[PDB]
Amino acid sequence: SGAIYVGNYRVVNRHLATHNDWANLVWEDSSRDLLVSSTTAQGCDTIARCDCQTGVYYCSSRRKHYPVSFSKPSLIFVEASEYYPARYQSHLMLAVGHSEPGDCGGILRCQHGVVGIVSTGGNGLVGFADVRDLLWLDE
């Protein structure tokens, strides 16, 4: 579990979004596993605007932060689940690192700020849904 709070927005994994998130819906994309909802309070997370391929992510199943090298955002096949049928997920970045069910929502950051959130994983791999192209989160 976990979310990004920037201005009047809350960014969460779409498969984990709440009733309140859906009642205050701004934008959602099943192919990216992202949902953004509106908030009354101000969020102070800074979003990165860069092409960094190194950073640090939070792993709740280990209660630790890990440094990682990650790939550029791309279309990657993701196996079926109680949340989605088998499909390609867009804007996805992979890294060699630990992750397991329960870790989605952990933030990935570089020196410039928030890069994305854990969205997929397994087999000594971790997948991050990128948020750096969502320029409207600032304005």
Ligand X SMILES: CS(=O)(=O)c1ccccc1CC(=O)N1CCC[C@H](C(N)=O)C1
CA gap 87, 85 in Å, rounded: 6
Active-site residue flag, 91? no
Q: From CA 93, how far away is CA 53, in angstroms rounded?
A: 9
Catalytic member of 21, 33, 103, 130: 33
Name the DSSP letter for residue 70: B
Nearest approach, Cβ of 132 to Zn ion (angstroms)?
Answer: 8
* Angle at alpha carbon of residue 31, lines to 70 and 114, rounded to 5°: 40
Q: Which one of 3, 95, 119, 130 is in contact with ligand X (CB under 6 A)?
A: 119
CA dist 121 and 100 (Å) reads 7
- Contacts of 78 by beta carbon, 8 Å cutoff, 6+ apart: 84, 86, 87, 88, 89, 92, 120, 127
Closer CB to ligand X, 46 or 61, in the complex: 61
Q: How far apart are CA 118 and CA 17, in angstroms?
A: 14
Q: Which does 52 bind (CB under 5 to 8 A by kind): ligand X, Zn ion, none?
A: Zn ion
Site map for Zn ion, 48-77, x if CB under 5 A? Answer: x-x-x-------------------------
Near ligand X in 50-109, by CB under 6 A = 78, 81, 83-84, 89, 99-101, 103-104
> For residues 15 and 112, which CB has a smaller minimum distance to ligand X in the complex?
15
Q: Which residues are annotated as a binding site?
A: 50, 52, 110, 112
Residues that bind ligand X (CB under 6 A): 15, 33, 78, 81, 83-84, 89, 99-101, 103-104, 118-122
Annotated binding site for Zn(2+): 50, 52, 110, 112
